[PDB]
Design a protein around this nucleic acid. Structure first.
Lengths: 97, 95, 83, 75, 109, 97, 83, 109, 95
DNA sequence: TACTTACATGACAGGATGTATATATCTGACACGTGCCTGGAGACTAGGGAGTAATCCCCTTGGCGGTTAAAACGCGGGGGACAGCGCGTACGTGCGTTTAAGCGGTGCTAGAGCTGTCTACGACCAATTGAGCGGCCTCGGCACCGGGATTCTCCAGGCGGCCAGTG
DNA sequence: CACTGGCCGCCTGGAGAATCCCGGTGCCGAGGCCGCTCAATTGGTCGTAGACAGCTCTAGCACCGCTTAAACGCACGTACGCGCTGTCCCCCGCGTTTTAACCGCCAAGGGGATTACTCCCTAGTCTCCAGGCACGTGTCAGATATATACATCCTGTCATGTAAGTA
């Protein structure tokens, strides 16, 4: 039978691999499409520098992973390991946004 | 005597009687309003300085401070502030 | 030219891989759409500020300098893009 | 009116017979399938559990008190 | 033969002093120079802000049947507006206390 | 039988009474002594204006109020009506110290 | 001359009143001492700024305007004593 | 007929440029006057900061046995120091990632 | 024709070779150091400007930045930067 | 098995009390009147920054041809979340005592703070230069690739202990 | 009640894939050198800002006396978290399938940026004057006081469900 790891240890393998990693986890082209889509909602015909799309990508990545460590702190407060939207809302409320 | 110590108390009194002629004011609340005026003023001054320096502008204009309001003031408060300031500057430019 | 549904452009494995960088072992099924929403409002704030910076500069092409300035004045200063 | 609810508890716990004891979740949904106001009778089922554990007809598998899971006795 | 001295606050129809805010910008060192419409716009912004928060303060005081504003009225004015709270979340009012805010879960049944 | 109220009801009335209150909640003189005590650990024979003692008083109590609102959010997030100092510690950790 | 314990002067009932303002309904006994500690830390942070300001002001009595400025640095700008 | 050209940084024995920081303070508009010890003091502070952070980055790169520093090394340098996290709690580093921080409960057993 | 964009390149490279002669740089990390020096400069300069505003002094001396470095930078980093600046300004006055 | 009975648990009612609700008073802080002078502006000027046209070129935008990595989907399933519940449990709450803060009351002096000096110092222009950045190459430290070792991670046999079955 | 077999939980030994780990190959970005240029420097002057010196006068330091709420500690009811044993179900993981992102390449022009011109605008400064600051002073809103209604809330007695005994 083909080999199968227990639920979770592949996730921790990803944890170790990606904390040793530095590479941008968000796909570049749809992120650029989303930035253009959001900006077109506010001001029309907006062009984005490629480096600007990049800097937005590390912005989104670092903001989200910071909020994710924050929610993991909220989860280990809540005796849980699977984070929930209410952890996210808690982080949003106690951070003040 | 003493040196004159400045405050915005008379103008808070003027707008207070303008919008509510019948009401009173205390000294502690007056200090709160003076601190509020100082705080909002320094925030807008800071954002205006940043916008001036980012565009290498040696002057802060109504465009700069309007931008600074759009950054600081959230939403429909910012649109009403733009409307009020636009009406004020049109009245001022009408001399 | 118009784009409609780029909220799903940040894919579910992209969110999972973010939370893998985010120290998150298990991610609930409700996480993805609501994190898409908070990323959306975050980018709404940041891009609104940056677009205001650009049109204050009378520019039409958004630059990374205005992005890092929009980040910095929200208390989110970024290093490495001319800030 | 009808029969007492403890009989319903006994048939509900005798219906399944897992290798381990039955916790309150499967028990309360067995009563829901049989038909019972489980929301308004938490105290009634608590006193029923205390009565059935205390008198010695039913034995507790691994839990303590009304907490935990429950199986049938030896005979 | 000097002209009669009018005020820039009256020129823009404002109650805030254009002169004092302009002096505070000029001597507060925020730029080398200041465009003339900027202090007028600024005084208009602060006049609208102070005016409507005094609107909320006066209406809250008339709700509590007292005519004179205490800092509790200012806390009740600011904290009861969501958008001002977005402006002033991190700011402390002296002797304003706390907005009446009780979580429904810790309220009894 | 002397009349006695159930727990939390007096506590809730306390919560209502001091949210309704605007006054200073700390005894003034020991606060003055404590800020003098901490001051003497930094520079010798320092003195305080009464107004500075006032402002430190309202700021100290308000910062503590902010920590207890954060504490309340964390505690209900922890599904507890009795708070623990680990909730305050998590609140301090998320708040950005 | 010197004082060695005034932190207990921020009394257990007073800490209870402060948490009653925040809506805390039940308080375990562990919290009071750590709140005294973090208040010691916060007042240490503020009053370090305050003595630094006052020493830069070359004064030996602290003014409230130093307090407001020190709180403005820390990000908890306090209304009611500015000026 | 003229004194030989001698920079203020070599006078102080610092290699951040004193004239540059003085220029950037003069046209950064923080005051209309700047004391002569102020920019050399600031350049000394910055040189100690950069020397400390490049020492940490160099040891991190040696432990990663790479000759040239990468922003991963800078992220490791910042996050593994307490007072640097005190200095830059709200700072984003491009492509630095995060410090290896797994919570104790996340590990098995 | 290109216009020069100023940075902190050769200075950070010099302090690197003085602190580690055999360790190199990447360009991205070099941009990180440029942004770091810019951010810390802005923090110190703005805090100094507010200090000069507070005491009504029209000037930033070394004592203003000494105040600011005790303010923002905590403890060991602050006092050792104080020591570096102190010996630096004594050497500057001696030259 | 239905019928009757008596107690735990809610259903219903009611009185004490704290906080809200009805005026009475006297007080001082708030509203208001007065001298003024410090500050608000008016006009001219110096001069300086910034708005605008051109353009160019380079960097972005639009377009195509494969490519599997990556996205997406489906099933197995171990694992995470958790509902409730005894159970020790730790804390709220009532209440007399104590004491130290609060009120209120005096000396003063040391220190906050205003004012005249004059010096220390900084800002700024012309000339000159030399250090610092753009350009470019070149090359070896690094980017990429191929094969064992070990580490990790699941799996499997053995022993014991526990659990169940029978005479 | 004692014997005894059987099955799972942990101990113990095995096996194979993912990534170290070790060796091998090219290539690109680091940095070193060259060219440039502009910014840092210095001398000197102008001017002016702030420490010094001295005084003065006000609020904190210091001390003193009466009082009652702060508090505080004990009693005691009594609300609390939480481990836990399951159960429910829900993403995690391991595949297969599919598709569009990435790469690589190609053509277009948009506007970012630079230079130049020009003119719009705004600080500075003297001066004149005027409106809010300082200061003084009266005075009703409320701070305090005394009597009353109602939440409220917890508690006293009934209703009902239900468990238990029984013909």
């Amino acid at each position: 039978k083909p080999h199968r790891y227990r639920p979770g240890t592949v996730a921790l393998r990803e944890i170790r691999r990606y904390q040793k990693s530095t590479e941008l986890l968000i796909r570049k082209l749809p992120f650029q499409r989303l930035v253009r889509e959001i900006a077109q909602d506010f001001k029309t015909d907006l062009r984005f520098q490629s480096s600007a799309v990049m800097a937005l990508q590390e912005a989104s990545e670092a903001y989200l992973v910071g909020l994710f460590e924050d929610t993991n702190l909220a989860a280990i407060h809540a005796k849980r390991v699977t984070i929930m939207p209410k952890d996210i809302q808690l982080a949003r409320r106690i951070r003040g946004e | 005597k003493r040196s004159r110590k400045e405050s915005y108390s008379v103008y808070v009194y003027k707008v207070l009687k303008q919008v509510h002629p019948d009401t009173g004011i205390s000294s502690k609340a007056m200090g709160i309003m003076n601190s509020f005026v100082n705080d909002i003023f320094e925030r807008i001054a800071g954002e205006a300085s940043r916008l001036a320096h980012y565009n290498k502008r040696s002057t802060i204009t109504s465009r700069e401070i309007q931008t600074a309001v759009r950054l600081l003031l959230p939403g429909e408060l910012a649109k009403h502030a733009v409307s009020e300031g636009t009406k004020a500057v049109t009245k001022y430019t009408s001399a | 030219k118009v784009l409609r549904d780029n909220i799903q452009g940040i894919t579910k494995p992209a969110i999972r891989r973010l939370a893998r960088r985010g120290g998150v072992k298990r991610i609930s099924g409700l996480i993805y759409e609501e994190t898409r929403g908070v990323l959306k409002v975050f980018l709404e704030n940041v891009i609104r500020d940056a677009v205001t910076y650009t049109e204050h500069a009378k520019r039409k092409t958004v630059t990374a300098m205005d992005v890092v300035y929009a980040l910095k004045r929200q208390g989110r200063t970024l290093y490495g893009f001319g800030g | 009116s009808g029969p007492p609810v403890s009989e319903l508890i006994t048939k509900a716990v005798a219906a399944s017979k897992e290798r381990s004891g039955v916790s309150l979740a499967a028990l309360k949904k067995a009563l829901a399938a049989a038909g019972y106001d489980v929301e308004k009778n938490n105290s009634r089922i608590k006193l029923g559990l205390k009565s059935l554990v205390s008198k010695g007809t039913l034995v507790q598998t691994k839990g303590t008190g009304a907490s935990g899971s429950f199986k049938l006795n030896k005979k | 033969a000097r002209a009669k001295a009018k005020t820039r606050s009256s020129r823009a129809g404002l109650q805030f002093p254009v002169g004092r805010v302009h002096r505070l910008l000029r001597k507060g060192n925020y730029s080398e120079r200041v465009g003339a419409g900027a202090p007028v716009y600024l005084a208009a912004v602060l006049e609208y802000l102070t005016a409507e928060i005094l609107e909320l303060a006066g209406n809250a005081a008339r709700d509590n049947k007292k005519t004179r504003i205490i800092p509790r009225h200012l806390q009740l004015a600011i904290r009861n507006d969501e958008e001002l709270n977005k402006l002033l979340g991190r700011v402390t009012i002296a002797q304003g206390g706390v907005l009446p805010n009780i979580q429904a879960v810790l309220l009894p049944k």
